[PDB]
Design a protein around this ligand. Structure first.
Ligand SMILES: CCCCCCCCCCCCCCCCCC(=O)OC[C@H](COP(=O)(O)OCCN)OC(=O)CCCCCCCCCCCCCCCCC
Ligand code: SF4
Ligand code: SF4
Ligand code: SF4
Lengths: 209, 171, 118, 303, 144, 176, 156, 70, 90
């Protein structure tokens, strides 16, 4: 939860200071007093929406430092779950944007789809959300028999559901009337304000790691 | 609950007028004026009374004490009763009692007049064949004959709009 | 008659409206009273004998209730217990000889007289 | 007899409001992918009974404010509006015949505005005051539109009495000679119910609860009488009453059905929307509904 | 077609056992899809598996009255289930547990004592530890 | 390989501009959205009944913190402290003593259920599979004393059921 | 025993009324918040049980506190807690909040919400799955079944 | 499906069906199989007043049918 | 007195609801202000308009038609004046 100190002329602004800091935990100090393998769930859950991508970042950091190459099948499963987790992160961002702006039901439609996502993480590792699951050195405790066909079915149904989400929202005139005029970002400001990723995608410059 | 019901509602009417004439906090004054307007509408509908009191009920108690409470909300504070206010309400109660006493246990009340003090069912119509509720065709005469009158009224309302915006910083 | 955040007679003073007499009376705030109690319960040789807590002020009743109203922004068994007596007993010791300081009425009275208008 | 009629009006407001709350929660649940409330007893009617009596016999939200008198006086106004604002609405034999009822509807809506303003002044510190002030402004910004549209639809049938309206709706429905005026009036009723797509982002919540939900059912009944319906035959009123109830239920389901689908507005976009989209179009359709009956040889039999 | 749904939808209540059999399970919580009768087991509980509904509503359970003397006609708990049906009922498996229920081991309970917190009979923590430093005993024999 | 959107224009065919005007004044696509939401209204709810039906899971779920014992045998733990050495919030507390028989044993084997975080490290670390993450998850406890597991609490929690745990391991000891 | 029996049924009435709905405020700091929003999901419904998610604190019955409760968070937590009516219950969800847990040896972090609020229902897990949390809420309702409040007022 | 929502809608519609039904029932009972004479104008009130005058029972729904011509 | 008795019964029932509910459980912006007065003047011109259907039956129709359309024209003139002279802008 942010604290926000907004200095406003009314139904307008003048300035604002977002106090971030209320959810400070001490992850850096805790990892400075731990090992690698014990501290790996910190890099599973400091970001909590991405639940495999931060593991991927820590694992490729340790493998990049350690001069030890992972096997190919571990890399393909890592890419597969990275794309799955990317899907989960964007669908959470869309649905909680919709909840914060109004828009109560498509939130729950895509949360049904994300419940199937959590069911897939259950079937793979066991966890609902905090599947640590990634040793530096490839995927440990690999996927069982009877997963890929289910991912295939989920892919077909989810392509249908995301076309239906673009039908319900997305040229919805009142949501366009709600959010067009705000959010302008110059590419110079996008590079000098330390922006990275979706801001750089959405404002001008081609950039993709 | 007797014959003098218009007189009773008039007593409650003067009660409300005294209740905000005692100078309270302005939202309590607005409350007293709202009760006063409701019972005045009741009086004028009791004397029949088709349209006019329900018409003012939208205007004053639909669009004027709204702005009273609006300006009381935005401007004044009361950011921390008084003997003068409570004493003036006592004097209002006592003078109403004195006037009602000189009505009831005497013949009549005369200040500089001759008020025949009795029940105000007189005077009243002896049931004539109205059939169209003569207040209604009366207010309908404002558009049959009102050439000059609605012109000057609407022109003053246009002036009211431009004067309000100019004083509160036109343009 | 101890006074505190959920006092009986201070709330009886505040939430009111009643007569007038005069009676000597001393209140004492609760936390140093129970500090004396926990001193007696953590340190022996103070057993056997009996103790009595004494407040510091001990002044007139009606002026004290006026102090309560003037800090509180507004101008039968229990009420007879506060009308009747509150006397001193110089026999048995109290806060002083036990080695603990009792705070006066005023600072804690400001601390406890919340919840008036605005 | 007279007070029997009074009680048989004003006792089912409790049942009707509480069961409206169960129905609206179930319809939100099935517009969503949900059941419920259905596990607590049979199908969840006892569940509105139980949480209604809980919210009654919950602790009073103790002030923490001042002005106990005004804290009493605002929701007593809201709920006496809620009880005294189904009375002149004709389902065929109304409780009180009146020469005029529609300006009474408008005046009681303005009294609901008074209720909101009194609760806002007696509420809290300054932020609740500013929020209640903006709520009063967005509530008051529609008793121009609703009033003038209701004026132009009573102009098609003359009398204020509204029983002449339920006479004149026998041949064809009134949605056909005024569809856009009726649509704009229905959007104004969505504004006056203060629900989605509009904003509230306390106590007595039971009375404010009851007042808003009775206002919803009132506007739905007044809609179902106002712009549609069917013929009324004497010596069989229950037929028209059943048809009336079916149409009002389907319109209230339509209301909640539109509620569950769209995000909120922006406040300056709301006033922009209001003035610069309703108010010339209201005036235009109203002046055309003035100039048309004088040119189609049809001035109404307002006797 | 609407009279063919009412004709189909009234049979599972009439085939439930009558009316007062269906009164019990409807006042209990929800179940209306009775008709498969897979398995009864200890604490008298009943396990019904339908395949026609979706994945999540295959396997449901009806509890009993006084399974361990707690008047559980109402207010059914989780962990009122035996462990082999607990394997079957979360769908970790897809085999019925009456094919191989037991293990050939004589240390497993017969109660499956349920959720016990909030009773006069529940759990406390303690120190499973013997004597710490063995404090000295004064001479209890009378010297001097 | 870049596929950008929001580069279009309202083309000035008269049918196009009158369709945008009809969209402005008539709310066509709003009624389209209502139609989509009614299409999801007339479906069936994808819900369950909780005290009767329970949701789907996997055999590799991490639950109860139960211990095991040998087939007609002893405690499976031999007090080798590896679960403390991998417990990332140090909820594992072990104090070990032998006995007069000769086989080494424990005294105290405790878990903070506050500090447990359900990795799987004390399952993948235990060299004889003594501590096993259980199948279920219903703790839901009204007090705070009743979440500090003793050794015999873990033994009766592993002996209230083990054929469940044995079935899970016997199904899925091959992968891990 | 006519008064005792009718007062007993009256206590059953009010306890059933309170255990019926219990619509909370969802506090929700870290990923336990996402698990609460996913026990608002269509698989596990709160609104089968009168449980409406609503962040209006004055009309909140119970309060689920979850996420990593910090020392910078705690005074605003208890200021929320004071303006909440006397029928109130606290459900501590999640290994962060029910005893510190993983961030337990860390500065600026409260060692679990025992040290801030009175706690009624501890539910562990990380994340405590929607099945477990819903089991905890049913056990809360059975605590509401066992209250004997009006019996204590009767024989008081 | 939507079979669960329909009994709640049904009972709430019964609560919407009841007040006008009972009101029209009471109006047809307390007039003797009539509709109550609505009083909009002073003309029809004078007509109703001479109606209640010629009844003699100090009510108006008696309507004294044709057996007092001469 | 009929509707007054109904109003009295509803008021007494609501006060009984309040007593069972209570005694038994024991700066600004200037741009805000233009809304109120602008509404007030629109509502006053509504007050001028609204007895129009009672006048729909007299022997004068052309003068009434022209003055009624003059009144809505002047209301739209005031609307366009504040609409173009930044009276309601943000
Ligand atoms: C209230 C209200 O508007 O009551 C109207 C009613 C008069 O009826 P109305 O529609 O004006 O037509 C005349 C023939 N009844 O008015 C009446 O019947 C008289 C009501 C008198 C009491 C009014 C008290 C107001 C407070
Ligand atoms: S699962 Fe729990 S006990 Fe085991 S290592 Fe992790 S935190 Fe420690
Ligand atoms: S890792 Fe296994 S055998 Fe070793 S001390 Fe822990 S529980 Fe015992
Ligand atoms: S207990 Fe686990 S799931 Fe909950 S907030 Fe903490 S890290 Fe997240």
């Amino acid at each position: 939860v942010l604290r926000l100190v907004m200095e406003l002329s009314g139904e307008m602004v003048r300035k604002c200071d977002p106090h971030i800091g209320l959810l400070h935990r001490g992850t850096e100090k805790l990892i400075e007093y731990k090992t690698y393998l014990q501290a790996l769930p910190y890099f599973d859950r400091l970001d909590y929406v991405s639940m495999m991508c931060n593991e991927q970042a820590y694992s490729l950091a340790v493998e990049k430092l350690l001069n030890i190459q992972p096997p190919p099948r571990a890399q393909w499963i890592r890419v597969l779950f990275g794309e799955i987790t990317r899907l989960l992160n964007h669908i959470m961002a869309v649905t909680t944007h919709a909840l914060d702006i109004g828009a109560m039901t498509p939130f729950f439609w895509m949360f049904e789809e994300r419940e199937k996502m959590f069911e897939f993480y259950e079937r793979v590792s066991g966890a609902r959300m905090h599947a640590a699951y990634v040793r530096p050195g490839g995927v440990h405790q690999d996927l069982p028999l009877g997963l890929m066909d289910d991912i295939y079915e989920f892919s077909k149904n989810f392509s249908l559901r995301i076309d239906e989400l673009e039908e319900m929202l997305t040229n919805n005139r009142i949501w366009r009337n709600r959010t067009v005029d705000i959010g302008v970002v110059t590419a110079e400001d996008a590079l000098n304000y330390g922006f990275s990723g979706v801001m750089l995608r959405g404002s001008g410059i081609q950039w993709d790691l | 609950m007797m014959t003098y019901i218009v007189f009773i509602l008039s007593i409650i009417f003067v009660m409300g007028f005294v209740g905000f004439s005692s100078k309270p906090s302005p939202i309590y004054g607005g409350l007293g004026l709202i009760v006063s307007g409701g019972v005045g509408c009741g009086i004028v509908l009791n004397f029949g009374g088709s349209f006019l009191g329900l018409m003012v009920f939208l205007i004053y108690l639909g669009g004027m004490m709204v702005v009273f409470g609006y300006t009381t909300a935005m401007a004044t504070e009361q950011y921390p009763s008084n003997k003068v206010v409570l004493g003036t309400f006592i004097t209002g109660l006592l003078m109403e009692f004195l006037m009602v006493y000189y009505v009831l246990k005497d013949k009549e009340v005369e200040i500089v007049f001759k008020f025949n003090g009795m029940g105000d069912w007189v005077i009243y119509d002896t049931g004539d064949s109205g059939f169209f509720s003569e207040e209604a065709m009366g207010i309908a005469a404002l558009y049959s004959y009102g050439t000059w009158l609605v012109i000057v009224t609407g022109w003053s309302l246009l002036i009211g709009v431009v004067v309000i915006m100019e004083i509160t910083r036109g343009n | 008659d101890i006074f505190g955040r959920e006092d009986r007679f201070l709330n009886y003073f505040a939430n009111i409206r009643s007569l007038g007499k005069k009676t000597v009376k001393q209140p004492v705030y609760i936390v140093d009273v129970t500090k004396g109690i926990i001193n007696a319960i953590k340190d022996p040789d103070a057993r056997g004998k009996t103790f009595a807590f004494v407040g510091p002020n001990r002044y007139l009743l009606f002026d004290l209730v006026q102090y309560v109203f003037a800090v509180a922004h507004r101008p039968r068994d229990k009420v007879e217990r506060i009308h009747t007596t509150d006397r001193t007993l110089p026999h048995l010791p109290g806060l002083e000889d036990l080695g603990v300081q009792a705070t006066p009425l005023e600072l804690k009275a400001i601390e406890v007289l919340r919840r008036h208008r605005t | 007899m007279f007070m029997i009629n009074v009680l048989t009006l004003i006792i089912p407001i409790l049942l009707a409001v509480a069961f409206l709350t169960l129905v609206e929660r179930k319809v939100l649940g099935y517009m969503q992918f949900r059941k419920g409330p259905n596990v607590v007893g049979p199908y969840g009617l006892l569940q509105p009974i139980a949480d209604a009596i809980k919210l009654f016999i919950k602790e009073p939200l103790r002030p923490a404010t001042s002005s106990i008198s005004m804290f009493i006086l605002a929701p007593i106004l809201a709920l006496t509006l809620a009880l005294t604002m189904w009375i002149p609405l004709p389902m065929p034999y109304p409780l009180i015949n009146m020469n005029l009822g529609v300006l009474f509807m408008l005046a009681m809506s303005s009294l609901a505005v008074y209720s909101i303003l009194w609760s806002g002044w007696a509420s809290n510190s300054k932020y609740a005051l500013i929020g209640a002030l903006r709520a009063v402004a967005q509530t008051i910004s529609y008793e121009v539109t609703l009033a003038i549209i209701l004026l132009s639809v009573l102009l098609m049938n003359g009398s204020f009495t509204l029983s002449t309206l339920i006479i004149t709706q026998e041949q064809v429905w009134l949605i056909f000679p005024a569809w856009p005026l009726a649509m704009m009036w229905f959007i104004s009723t969505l504004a006056e119910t203060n629900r989605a797509p509009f904003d509230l982002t306390a106590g007595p919540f039971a009375l404010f609860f009851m007042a808003e939900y009775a206002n919803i059912i009132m506007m739905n009944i007044f809609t179902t009488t106002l712009f549609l319906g069917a013929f009324h035959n004497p010596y069989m009123p229950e037929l028209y009453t059943i048809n009336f109830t079916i149409k009002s239920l389907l319109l209230s389901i339509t209301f909640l059905w539109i509620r569950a689908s769209y995000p909120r507005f922006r406040y300056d976009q709301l006033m922009h929307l209001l003035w610069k989209n309703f108010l010339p179009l209201t005036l235009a359709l109203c002046m055309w509904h003035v100039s048309l009956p004088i040119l189609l040889s049809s001035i109404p039999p307002q006797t | 077609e609407l009279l063919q749904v009412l004709k189909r939808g009234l049979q599972q209540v009439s085939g439930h056992g009558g009316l007062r059999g269906y009164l019990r399970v409807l006042f209990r919580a929800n179940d209306v899809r009775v008709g498969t009768l897979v398995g009864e087991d200890k604490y008298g509980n009943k396990y019904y598996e339908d395949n026609k509904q979706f994945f999540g509503r295959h396997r449901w359970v009806i509890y009993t009255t006084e399974m361990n003397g707690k008047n559980t006609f109402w207010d059914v708990d989780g962990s009122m289930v035996p462990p082999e049906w607990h394997r079957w009922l979360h769908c970790m498996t897809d085999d019925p547990p009456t094919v191989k229920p037991p293990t050939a081991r004589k240390f497993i309970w017969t109660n499956h004592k349920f959720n016990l917190s909030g009773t006069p009979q529940q759990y406390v923590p303690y120190s499973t530890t013997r004597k710490k430093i063995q404090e000295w005993v004064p001479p209890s024999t009378p010297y001097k | 390989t870049y596929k950008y959107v929001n580069l279009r224009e309202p083309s000035m065919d008269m049918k196009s501009v009158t369709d945008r005007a009809a969209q402005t004044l008539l709310w066509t696509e709003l009624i389209r959205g209502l139609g989509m939401t009614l299409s999801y209204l007339f479906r069936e709810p994808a819900t369950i009944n909780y005290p009767f039906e329970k949701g789907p899971l996997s055999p590799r779920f991490r639950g109860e913190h139960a211990l095991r014992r040998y087939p007609s045998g002893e405690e499976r733990c031999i007090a080798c402290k590896l679960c403390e050495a991998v417990c990332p919030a140090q909820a594992i507390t072990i104090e070990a003593e032998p006995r007069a028989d000769g086989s080494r044993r424990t005294t105290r084997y405790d878990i903070d259920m506050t500090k447990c975080i359900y990795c799987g490290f004390c399952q993948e670390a235990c060299p004889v599979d003594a501590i096993v993450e259980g199948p279920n998850f219903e703790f839901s406890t009204e007090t705070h004393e009743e979440l500090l597991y003793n050794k015999e609490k873990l033994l009766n929690n592993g002996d209230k059921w083990e054929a469940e745990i044995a079935a899970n391991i016997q199904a899925d000891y091959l992968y891990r | 025993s006519r008064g005792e029996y009718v007062v007993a049924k009256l206590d059953d009435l009010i306890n059933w009324a309170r255990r019926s709905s219990l619509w909370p405020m969802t506090f929700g700091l870290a990923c336990c918040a996402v698990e609460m929003m996913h026990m608002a999901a269509p698989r596990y419904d709160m609104d089968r049980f009168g449980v409406v998610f609503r962040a209006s604190p004055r009309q909140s019955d119970v309060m689920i506190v979850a996420g990593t409760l910090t020392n910078k968070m705690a005074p605003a937590l208890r200021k929320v807690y004071d303006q909440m009516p006397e029928p109130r219950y606290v459900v501590s969800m999640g290994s962060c909040a029910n005893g510190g847990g993983y961030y337990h040896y860390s500065y600026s972090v409260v060692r679990g919400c025992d040290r801030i609020v009175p706690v009624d229902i501890y539910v562990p897990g990380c994340p405590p799955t929607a099945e477990a949390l819903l089991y905890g809420i049913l056990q809360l309702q059975k605590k509401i079944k066992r209250e004997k409040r009006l019996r204590i007022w009767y024989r008081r | 499906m939507w079979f669960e929502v329909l009994p709640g809608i049904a009972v709430m519609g019964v609560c919407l069906f009841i007040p006008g039904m009972a009101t029209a029932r009471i109006h047809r009972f307390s007039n003797g199989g009539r509709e109550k004479r609505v009083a909009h104008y002073s003309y029809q009130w004078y007509l109703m007043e001479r109606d209640r005058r010629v009844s003699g029972v100090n009510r108006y729904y008696v309507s004294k049918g044709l057996e007092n011509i001469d | 007195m009929n509707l007054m008795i109904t109003l009295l019964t509803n008021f007494t029932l609501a006060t009984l609801l309040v007593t069972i509910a209570f005694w038994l459980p024991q700066p600004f912006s200037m741009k805000f202000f233009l809304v109120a007065i602008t509404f007030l003047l629109f509502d006053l011109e509504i007050a001028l308009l609204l007895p129009l259907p009672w006048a729909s039956q007299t022997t004068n129709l052309n003068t009434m038609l022209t003055m009624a359309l003059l009144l809505i024209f002047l209301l739209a003139v005031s609307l366009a004046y504040e609409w173009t002279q930044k009276g309601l802008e943000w």
